[PDB]
Amino acid sequence: TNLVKNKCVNFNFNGLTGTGVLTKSNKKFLPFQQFGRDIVDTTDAVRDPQTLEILDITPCSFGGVSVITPGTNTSNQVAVLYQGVNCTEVSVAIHADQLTPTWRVYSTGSNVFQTRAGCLIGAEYVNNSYECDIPIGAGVCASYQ
Amino acid sequence: TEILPVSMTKTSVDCTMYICGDSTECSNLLLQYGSFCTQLKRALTGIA
């Protein structure tokens, strides 16, 4: 089958099966060795059995899903924190149906903010500093104001 | 000088991708082991 890069796909390189994102690598392999492993003995690079091109294997995006809620007694509005992922990857996985949680938060614009803890959807980022009410991470906190 | 550790790295475990990793049969078999996943997740959240 044809080669697809920069996309989470199920690959099979001469019996080596797995899932991940294939990208162009700068690793200079030797002619006899085919696939590479890191210190933890996980496959991080392979060669094309036909093109002989070295491709980096990056695992597909995953992480924890955290829900920020002011409490049922206050409101039913919630914010979702996709931990450890860029907002662009979440937008791509929402535009095309690839994200595991079937529910999707409505991106109304200016409500998708990128934090160092992950992508925050459902809350707007203000420039005013307040006391931390709901700890999100990396110095960012949420509140219902 | 006096150096004292204050905190350590906060770690989270999926408890399913580690044991199974996108395997449905493995997940169905792990569902029969009880709430060990929940206990591990709760302990890690408490540590964090």
Binding site: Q83 | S12, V13
Partner: peptide
């Protein structure tokens, strides 16, 4: 000097609440 001296299958590292700053 202290900052300069002190130098993935389901395992996620959570960032601290308070940043170094």
């Amino acid at each position: 000097l202290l900052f300069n001296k002190v130098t993935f299958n389901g395992l996620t590292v959570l960032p601290p609440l308070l940043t170094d700053e």
